[PDB]
Ligand binder design. Structure first.
Ligand SMILES: CCCc1c(OCCCOc2ccc3c(ccn3CC(=O)O)c2)ccc2cc(C(=O)c3ccccc3)ccc12
Length: 271
């Protein structure tokens, strides 16, 4: 129902603002230079990487395994730590989606287990342009070309994300749009091993109607934006199946690699 659909939209945009500190609005301002907090330190090579890590002079530590290895491996590790933080933010957001915490608890685990990395890549695009990605809460910017440069396997984790982002970003979605799109993703009744499918679909159906209205109102001139966004769901699933495969490569080419227990849980027997 129309006002119900707008009340759902405004609800999700509100939890979204509450769960994710670095929104797209805030990322675009930094990327584009519109703010007056702190212009980002750019990492484009080995020497600037050293300086950027070794920055830590008025901006100090997060609980990440700081450094005991080569470059390719320690960038991977910072990816891991940050992807862990993101899971917590995304779980906090998921509890706010109406109907979510009412579902069978094994289903809640399962929607999270399969939805979290799709959401991670959707929202990473918010921090990216064609030239690179904002890192450490918008304090750093690491260039696409530096990332593409990395010794084989790791060089390949990054580029697909960039290719997806420039195209997703051409949709010009804003935070209020993303808040509904991300909930549509999580409420996906096709995740392997769901026990009660129909309650999830019913909730997703209502989010779909709300997403459609939201785009038609927010983006009047954008023909078929709703379909175009749902089409990106397929680029997202491909990103994740790709990433999982690059994970299997890392187990072969690398010595002790070692994921965080939360990440190990999510990847355990994943698709
Ligand atoms: C979600 C990851 C976001 C991200 C970057 O993303 C750009 C490409 C995104 O593609 C991904 C996303 C998640 C990933 C990987 C590789 C591993 N993961 C997480 C995993 O599934 O283990 C690749 C690039 C450099 C980063 C660098 C950091 C750092 O704090 C950092 C650590 C050491 C030196 C300099 C910076 C943190 C996040 C970064």
């Amino acid at each position: 129902e129309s006002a119900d659909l707008r009340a759902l939209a405004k609800h999700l945009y509100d939890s979204y603002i509450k769960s994710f500190p670095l929104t797209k609005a805030k990322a675009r301002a930094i990327l584009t230079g519109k703010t007056t907090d702190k212009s980002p330190f750019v990492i484009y090579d080995m020497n600037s990487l050293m300086m950027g890590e070794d920055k830590i002079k008025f901006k100090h530590i997060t609980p990440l395994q700081e450094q005991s290895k080569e470059v390719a491996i320690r960038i991977f590790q910072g990816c891991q730590f940050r992807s862990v933080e993101a899971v917590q933010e995304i779980t906090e957001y998921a509890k706010s989606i109406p109907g979510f915490v009412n579902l069978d608890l094994n289903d809640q685990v399962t929607l999270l287990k399969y939805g979290v990395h799709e959401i991670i890549y959707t929202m990473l695009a918010s921090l990216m342009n064609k030239d690179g990605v904002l890192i450490s809460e918008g304090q750093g910017f690491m260039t696409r070309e530096f990332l593409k440069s990395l010794r084989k396997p790791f060089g390949d984790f990054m580029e697909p994300k960039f290719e997806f982002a420039v195209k997703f970003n051409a949709l010009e979605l804003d935070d209020s749009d993303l808040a509904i799109f991300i909930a549509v993703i999580i409420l996906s009744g096709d995740r392997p091993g769901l026990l009660n499918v129909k309650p999830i679909e019913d909730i997703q159906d209502n989010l779909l109607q709300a997403l459609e209205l939201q785009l038609k109102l927010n983006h009047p001139e954008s023909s078929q934006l709703f379909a175009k966004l749902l089409q990106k769901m397929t680029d997202l699933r491909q990103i994740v199946t790709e990433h999982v495969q690059l994970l299997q490569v890392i187990k072969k080419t690398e010595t002790d690699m070692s994921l965080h227990p939360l990440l190990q849980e999510i990847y355990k027997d994943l698709y």
